[PDB]
Amino acid sequence: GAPATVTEQGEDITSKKDRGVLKIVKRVGNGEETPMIGDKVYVHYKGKLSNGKKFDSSHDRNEPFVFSLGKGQVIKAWDIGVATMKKGEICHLLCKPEYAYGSAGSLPKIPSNATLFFEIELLDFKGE
Numbered sequence: 001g002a003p004a005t006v007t008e009q010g011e012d013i014t015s016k017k018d019r020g021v022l023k024i025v026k027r028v029g030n031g032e033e034t035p036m037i038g039d040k041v042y043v044h045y046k047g048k049l050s051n052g053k054k055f056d057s058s059h060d061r062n063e064p065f066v067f068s069l070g071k072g073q074v075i076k077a078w079d080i081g082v083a084t085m086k087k088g089e090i091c092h093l094l095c096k097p098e099y100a101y102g103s104a105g106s107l108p109k110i111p112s113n114a115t116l117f118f119e120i121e122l123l124d125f126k127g128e
């Protein structure tokens with residue numbers, strides 16, 4: 001499935017070039033602008049452990065998820081990955097533990113040393 005395809009063929013979007021954050025565009029977005037550090041960004045998403053059977057269903061998929069880009073409000077993989085998205089884009093993102101919850105995890109749902117997989121839809125962003 002998509003997690004395996006992204007693992008094998010995804011673009012490495014990390015500064016270290018450690019394949020720690022891998023991306024494949026699912027739906028091409030609009031324009032060329034991407035969100036900038038400090039912007040408020042608004043997304044829809046689905047996430048899971050990369051080997052999991054189903055996407056987690058413990059948020060309202062209709063409500064935007066909002067955060068300030070590049071401020072460490074979300075896991076590193078999202079700060080890196082959302083920065084690369086155009087408005088309207090949907091991507092797949094595969095996140096190795098160092099760019100997610102690392103050795104501590106977030107128990108019980110996220111074990112220690114967990115690789116994560118997301119589908120992210122960028123709705124909007126603004127610099128206000």
Ligand SMILES: COc1ccc(CC[C@H]2OC(=O)[C@@H]3CCCCN3C(=O)[C@@H](C3CCCCC3)NC(=O)C3(CC3)NC(=O)COc3cccc2c3)cc1OC
Pocket residue numbers: 045047048049056058059065072073074075076078100101102109116
């Ligand atoms: C700077 O590093 C961090 C900053 C914040 C956190 C707290 C968790 C943070 O969640 C995430 O960053 C990511 C990506 C944004 C959507 C949610 N998320 C998750 O990992 C998922 C997760 C669920 C289980 C399968 C794997 C993905 N979390 C969720 O979807 C839920 C259940 C609903 N939890 C939350 O969204 C809790 O609220 C927030 C709100 C902001 C940041 C994070 C969590 C953890 C961090 O490092 C470990």
